[PDB]
Ligand binder design. Structure first.
Ligand SMILES: C/C=C(/N=C/c1c(COP(=O)(O)O)cnc(C)c1O)C(=O)O
Ligand SMILES: C/C=C(/N=C/c1c(COP(=O)(O)O)cnc(C)c1O)C(=O)O
Ligand SMILES: C/C=C(/N=C/c1c(COP(=O)(O)O)cnc(C)c1O)C(=O)O
Ligand SMILES: C/C=C(/N=C/c1c(COP(=O)(O)O)cnc(C)c1O)C(=O)O
Ligand SMILES: [S]
Ligand SMILES: [S]
Ligand SMILES: [S]
Ligand SMILES: [S]
Lengths: 392, 392, 398, 392
C-alpha cells in the first residue's frame, strides 16, 4: 500500500495510457460517441465499461472519484457540483416518505434548511440526537430509522461524535451511517475505517484548498455510490461537476497533506494564544488539553484541525469590534483556504436557523469562527493581537 | 430594444466597469469578503446588494443570467450545473405532497424518471395529457393542479403544444406553466411572451453550441426565480454552475443566431431529402408541410429547428444498420453541437422508460433522431445517402 | 455518390479535420492536454523522441497533442502541409523571421506594416545585421527591380494594417520563384476562409489568431502554416530556442472552439461591413472611405480576384481631420474605442496614436498612415443597431 | 514586512477592490476599451496608467508580476509564455552585435542552443567562464562585456556561482548580471539581494509545482524590466503568458514554501542513501557535507534543493537499466513537479550539445538527474533501491 501523499499524487493514473501525459488530459466534453449503437445500448443498460454522458460519468471525474475513494479507504467515489450536491444527492436517494433520519445536534445551515424545509416537507421524519451519547441514540432508534447523518467535528461549535459507537448501533438496526467529513478531510479522519457507510464533503474547502472552485464528493460502497450516481445525481439533483473544476480539485489534493500540516500547526499556536487571553470567555479547539471531548477527538482525528470557535466577553458587541478590526484575516464565510477567514455563524452561515433554533442547537450569538490559513504564524498572531485590543 | 444578436453579445455588460476589459473577467472564486460584519449580515438578510458565496450567486453567473433573461424576454435568470439541475431545482421548489403536476405526453428520459421515480415517490401526483388537445387539458385541470410542465417540440417525436392556449387554461384555473425550451432556444421561440411563467433549458445543447460544458438555465419572474435560487438550488440540489463553464456558455451565446440559422437551413435540406427516400417510412420535421402541426409550428417558432426524427421501413434492424453506417455523423446522445449526431431514443435517451411506457408515450422502436450540425450540407447528405443504402 | 476522394467542405474540416472521437475514449470534444511534460516507457524511446525517429511527445514547448490538432486543422484550412501554434501573432512573426534570416540577408517588406511588426524589423532584427527594404508590393515592376542576390525573404500583409493596401500574391510568388526568395504573407485580416496565400504561391502564412480565428477576444495566439520543412525549422529554431512563444493548451482549445464558427462569423462580419461601408460612402462628413467591397476602393479588382469576400474592416476619414475623428469616436455608444479586430464586438480606433504610435510622425506620412484615419472592425451585432450608432455619432461630429 | 508565505498568498491584492472576490478574477481578455480616445492616446504614450492590450500588460499578469517581484525582493516583474520566453526576451533586449556575453560553463540545453545557434549567429560574442573562479572571471572581462549570465546551481551538474563576487566584478565595468534562479526559487535563494540585476525563471518548474503550465518570469529593476517588456516581449518574441496560466501559476505559488520544504526533505534522504550505495560512483547534491561547494551553497541557498545528479559505475549501460526499472519515478524531462522524475541529460535536456561540447562543459555520459517529488519518502526509497538492484 503506497502512502497517503503518494496516492494523492498518483492513484488511478499511469501517464503511459494517455500518450505519456504527466498531468491527465482534461475531458471537457458533455458527451461521448459509440463505435456501434449496440455498444451504446449496452452502456445505457449498465452492462458495459465505458462512457456516454458526463452528467452520469466522465474520465476526469472518474479519476478524481477513484483517488478520493483511495484516500478515504472506500470502494467508490462520486464528484458533484457542490457539497450540498453531495448531501442532497445522497439523501434524496436513501430516503422516502415514512423513513426517519436521525441527525446530529448541530448542522451546517443549508444542511439544516434542506432537512427541515426541503426533504422534511416531503414526508421524511427528522429527529435530532446528541451523537456522542450512545444511550440517547439507541433510545431514539425506531424501525423506520433508515439513515443516521452527522458532522464530526460539527459546524460551527466543534462537537464530536463517537463514530464507531454510532456505527455499531446502526449495524444492529440496519441503518446507513453518513458522515460529513469536510472539516477533517481523509488526511486527518477516515469515518469509513470507523464503520460509517458513506462520507460526504464540501470539496470546496480544504480538499480544493485555494477557494477557486465549488465541489462535492461522496465516498462509500460500490452499491451505495452506484445508487446515488444513478438516482440522486442523474435524476434528482443534476449537480454535475465541471471537468475543469475536477482537474483543479485534483491539483489541490496533491498538496493536501502539506497544507493540512500547516493549517493544523498554525491553528494550534493561535488557539494556545487565544487561551491565554483575558478578552476570551471560552474556546472550542480539539488540540487544547481543556477541550471537553479531547479523548474522543484523539481516537478519531490524527491532528486537531484548522478551525477554531471562540467567544469574547462583551458578547456580540465585542465580536463585531474584533472582526471589523482584522487586517490580514478576511471577513467571509467558507473555510480551508490558503487565506485566513473569520465569520459570525448566527448572522451568516447559520442564519437559516431561527434565534430559538440557534439557541437550543448550540449556536451562540457571541460565537466567532476562524478558518486558520497558511500565512506566516507571526503575521497572524499580530493581526489577532491588535483585533483583541481593538475589541475591548 | 437592441436586436437579438446585439443583446446576445452586449446585454448587461459595460467594459468601463471592469477596467476596460472587452471580455468580462471570470470570477472563479467560491467566496467573497465583507468590509464589515454588518455589511455581511445585511447581505445574508437580503437588505444589501452584494456577493457572499458562489452557490447562491456569483457575478460571472449573474451576467449569464441577465443575458439569458433578456434573450427570453423574462425578468430574471438562474444558471445551474445541468438541464436536470434546472428542472429539479424548479420542481422541488414549486411542488409539495398533494400537489398535482400535469405533464406533456412525451418527455426527455431523465425528466420522466425524475417525475415518476423521484419527486412522484415523495407524494406529488402526476398525470400525463396531450398538450395539443386543449379540451382534454381543460378536462384534466383540478384545484390541486399546481404546475403544467411540458417540452415543445417534445424530445424525441417533435410533438408540439399551443403554449398561449395552454397558458390561457392555466390562468383560468391558477396553475404555473413551466416550458422546456431546449430545442428552440430563445432565438426561435420565447414561451414567456406566450404566457408561460418559467422556461428551463439544457444549456448543454444549442446555447453552448460546442459540446464542451454541462449547464442549465431557468428564466421567469424575479419572484419565482428568487425562490428557485434560494430553495431549490441553495438547499435541495446544490447544482452550482462553474464560473469557468458560465464564461464558455456566454462565449457560445454570442454566435447563437448564426449557428441556429445554419442548423435550421441544414436540417431543412436534410429533411426534404429524407422525405423523398425509399427507405424512410415516416419523418417528423416541423419545416415539412406534411408535419401534422405545421400551422402551429409556423406560428410559434420563427424557424423549424435543427432536429429531425424519422422511421425507416425495416424497423429497429434497419435503424441499427443505418446508425452503424454513419461516418460523418457520430453515434451519441446530446444535440445542438457543431458536430452532427444520431441516436436511438428507445435504447438510449429514453431507456429509463419501460417498453409499455414508450409505446404509451410515443417513443417507438424504429425511431431515429438526428441533431443536424454545422458541417457542409453536401457532406452530410452523402453520409446519410450511403447509410440509407447500408440500412437495407 | 461521386467518390471518397472529394475534399470535405471548409466548414466540415473546421469542425472535424484531424480528430476521431473513437481514438480518445469516444470524447466528442478533444481532451485538453494541459501538461508541460510527457513521460517515456523506456529511456531509449525517450532518446529517439529527442533524436526525431520515434513519433510522439516529450515537452509542450516543442510539441503537444492539443496544439498538434489545432496546427493540422489550420494547415488543412490554409491548404498547407504543416502548422505551428504560438503564444501571439508577434510570436508567429518573430519565430518565423528569426529562423529564416541571418546577418547579410535582405528582407523586402510591404510599404505598410502592423506597428509591432515594423518595430521588430527596424528596431529589432534590423539592428542585428539584417538589411530591410520597403517596396510597393502592388507594383510588380518595382518589386522586380528591388530584388538583389541577398534578398532572402519577401514579407507583407494583404490587406495591410491599417490602410488596406493590397499585394498580388501570385505575382509576388512568381518573382520569388525566379530569384529564389521565401514569400511570407500575414493573412490575419482575411483568414483562410477568405484568402489562401499558400494556394497562390506563398511559402508561409502567419496569423494573429487573436483576431478573427479566435473571434471572441479572449485569447492571444499565433499561427504559422507552410511546408513541412519550413514549419519544422521554425518550430525547432525560432520557437524552441529564439522566442519561447509557447501557446497554452487551454488557449489552443479555445481557438479551435472559435474556428468551428469561422465561416459563419466571417459571413456576418462581411455582410455587416458591406452595409456599413455603403452607408458611410453616402454621408456628408466622409472625406474618403476605403472598403474592398466598394468600387471606389483603389485596388478593387485585385481585392475581387484574391479575396472571396471583402472583409470586416473599414478605414475612413471625416472632413475635420484629427479634430472631427476624435468627436465621432467619442460619441459611439455601441462600438467600443479599442485596438484589436475580429471580435464579436464592433470596435473603432486611431492608428496614428494607437496601433501605429511606434512609427514616427514622418514614417506615418511616408508609409501611408494619415492623421485623420479612423479604422473600424465591424462586429456581429444587428446591423440596424450599428447603423444607428454610427449615424448619431456622425451627427455629433458635425 | 509580512513573511514569505503571507506575501506568496496576499501580496498586491485586496479582495475589497474586486467586489470582495477572495480569489482574483481572471482577465482572460485580449483587449481593453477606453472611455475617450484622449485617454486611449495617453495609454500608448505612457502618460495614463490604464490598460490596452494583453501582449503589453494585463491585470492578472500584473498581479503575478508584482507578487514575484515581492518574493525575489526586486522592483518589477514580467510574466512570459515560458522560461525560454523570459531568457530570450531578456537577452534580445540587452545585447547587440559586437557585445559580449560571459556565460556559466554549464547551461540548460535550449539556453545553450539559443546562445550558440541563435543570438550568437547575429554577431553577439560568447565566452564561457567558471563563475565560482573570481580571478578567471575578472581576467575574462573585456570592454565588450555587457551581460554576465549563469544558472546557480547549474542544470544539470549542480555547480555553483559566487553571485556576490560576480556582482562586485560586474560593477567595475557597469555590466548587467542575469541569474537563472529556476532550481532554487525565491524561497531558497534571492540573487537580487546578493547583487544581481535580473533574475529569470522557468515558472513551468517549482513555481507552478504541478506540471500543468508552461511559463516564464523576469524580475529586476524597473528600468531594465520596462525595456524587456516593451522591446523583448512586445516586439522580439511575442512570448505572451495566458491569463488562465498566470492564474494557475499564482495558485501554485501559494504553496511554494510548503512544497519546497518537502522536495528538499525528500531529496536530502535520497541523497544520503545514494551516496552510500556501491553502484554509485559520484553524486552531486548540495546538502551532502562532501559537496565540493558546500560552504558557498550554504551562503546563498537556505536549503539544498530537490534536485540530485549522480553517476553509476556501469556507465551509460547501468544508467539505462536503472531508469527502465523505475516504477514510481517517471522517465521524463522537467522538474519541480509533485511527481518524481528521472532523466539522462546527454540524450535529452542537453542533446542540443555535441558529444565534445558536453564533455567540455561538464555533462557526462552516465549522469542520471533526479527531480525529487512530494511522494512518501519510503515509497521513493523502495523504487530507487530496486532500480539500483536492476542496474548492476
Ligand atoms: C459558506 C459555506 C460553508 N460550508 C459549507 C459546507 C457544506 C456545503 O458545501 P458547499 O458550499 O455546497 O460546497 C457541507 N458541509 C459542511 C460541513 C460545510 O461547511 C461554511 O461553513 O463556510
Ligand atoms: C444526453 C442528454 C439529452 N437531453 C438532455 C435534456 C435535458 C437535461 O439536460 P442536461 O443533460 O442535464 O444538461 C433537459 N431537457 C431536454 C429537452 C433535454 O434534451 C439528449 O436528448 O441527448
Ligand atoms: C492590437 C493588435 C492588433 N494587431 C495585431 C496584429 C499582429 C500581431 O498579433 P498579436 O497581437 O501578437 O496577436 C500581427 N499581424 C497583424 C496583421 C495584426 O493586426 C491591431 O491592429 O488591432
Ligand atoms: C524540459 C525543460 C527543462 N528545463 C527548462 C529550463 C529553462 C527553460 O524553461 P521552459 O521550458 O521554456 O519553461 C530555463 N532554465 C532552466 C534552469 C531550465 O531548467 C528541464 O531541465 O527538464
Ligand atoms: S452560505
Ligand atoms: S441520456
Ligand atoms: S498595438
Ligand atoms: S527540452
Amino acid at each position: 500500500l503506497p502512502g497517503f501523499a503518494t496516492r494523492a499524487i498518483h492513484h488511478g493514473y499511469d501517464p503511459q495510457d494517455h500518450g505519456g501525459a504527466l498531468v491527465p488530459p482534461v475531458y471537457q466534453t458533455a458527451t461521448f460517441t459509440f463505435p456501434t449503437v449496440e455498444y451504446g445500448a449496452a452502456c445505457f443498460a449498465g452492462e458495459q465499461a465505458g462512457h456516454f454522458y458526463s452528467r452520469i460519468s466522465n474520465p476526469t471525474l472518474n479519476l478524481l472519484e477513484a483517488r478520493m475513494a483511495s484516500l478515504e479507504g472506500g470502494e467508490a467515489g462520486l464528484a458533484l457540483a457542490s457539497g450540498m450536491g453531495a448531501i442532497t444527492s445522497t439523501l434524496w436517494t436513501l430516503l422516502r416518505p415514512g423513513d426517519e433520519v436521525l441527525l446530529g445536534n448541530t448542522l451546517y445551515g443549508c444542511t439544516f434548511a434542506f432537512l427541515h424545509h426541503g426533504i422534511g416537507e416531503f414526508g421524511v421524519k427528522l429527529r435530532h440526537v446528541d451523537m456522542a451519547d450512545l444511550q440517547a441514540l439507541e433510545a431514539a432508534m425506531t424501525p423506520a430509522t433508515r439513515v443516521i447523518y452527522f458532522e464530526s467535528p460539527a459546524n460551527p461549535n466543534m462537537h464530536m461524535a463517537d463514530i464507531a459507537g454510532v456505527a455499531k448501533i446502526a449495524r444492529k438496526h440496519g441503518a446507513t451511517v453518513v458522515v460529513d467529513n469536510t472539516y477533517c478531510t481523509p488526511y486527518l479522519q477516515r469515518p469509513l475505517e470507523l464503520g460509517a457507510d458513506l462520507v460526504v464533503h464540501s470539496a470546496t474547502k480544504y480538499l480544493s484548498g485555494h477557494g477557486d472552485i465549488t465541489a462535492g464528493i461522496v465516498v462509500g460502497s460500490q452499491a451505495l455510490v452506484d445508487r446515488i450516481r444513478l438516482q440522486g445525481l442523474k435524476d434528482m439533483t443534476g449537480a454535475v461537476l465541471s471537468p475543469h473544476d475536477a482537474a483543479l480539485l485534483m491539483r489541490g489534493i496533491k498538496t493536501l497533506n502539506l497544507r493540512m500540516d500547516r493549517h493544523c500547526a498554525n491553528a494550534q499556536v493561535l488557539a494556545e494564544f487565544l487561551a491565554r487571553q483575558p478578552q476570551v470567555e471560552l474556546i472550542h479547539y480539539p488540540g487544547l488539553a481543556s477541550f471537553p471531548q479531547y479523548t474522543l477527538a484523539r481516537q478519531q482525528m490524527s491532528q486537531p484541525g484548522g478551525m477554531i470557535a471562540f467567544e469574547l466577553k462583551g458578547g456580540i458587541g465585542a465580536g463585531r469590534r474584533f472582526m471589523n478590526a482584522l487586517q490580514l484575516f478576511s471577513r467571509a464565510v467558507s473555510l480551508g483556504d490558503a487565506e485566513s477567514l473569520a465569520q459570525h455563524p448566527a448572522s451568516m452561515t447559520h442564519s437559516s436557523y431561527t434565534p430559538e433554533e440557534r439557541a437550543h442547537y448550540g449556536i451562540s450569538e457571541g460565537l466567532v469562527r476562524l478558518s486558520v490559513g497558511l500565512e506566516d504564524i507571526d503575521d497572524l498572531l499580530a493581526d489577532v493581537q491588535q483585533a483583541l485590543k481593538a475589541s475591548a
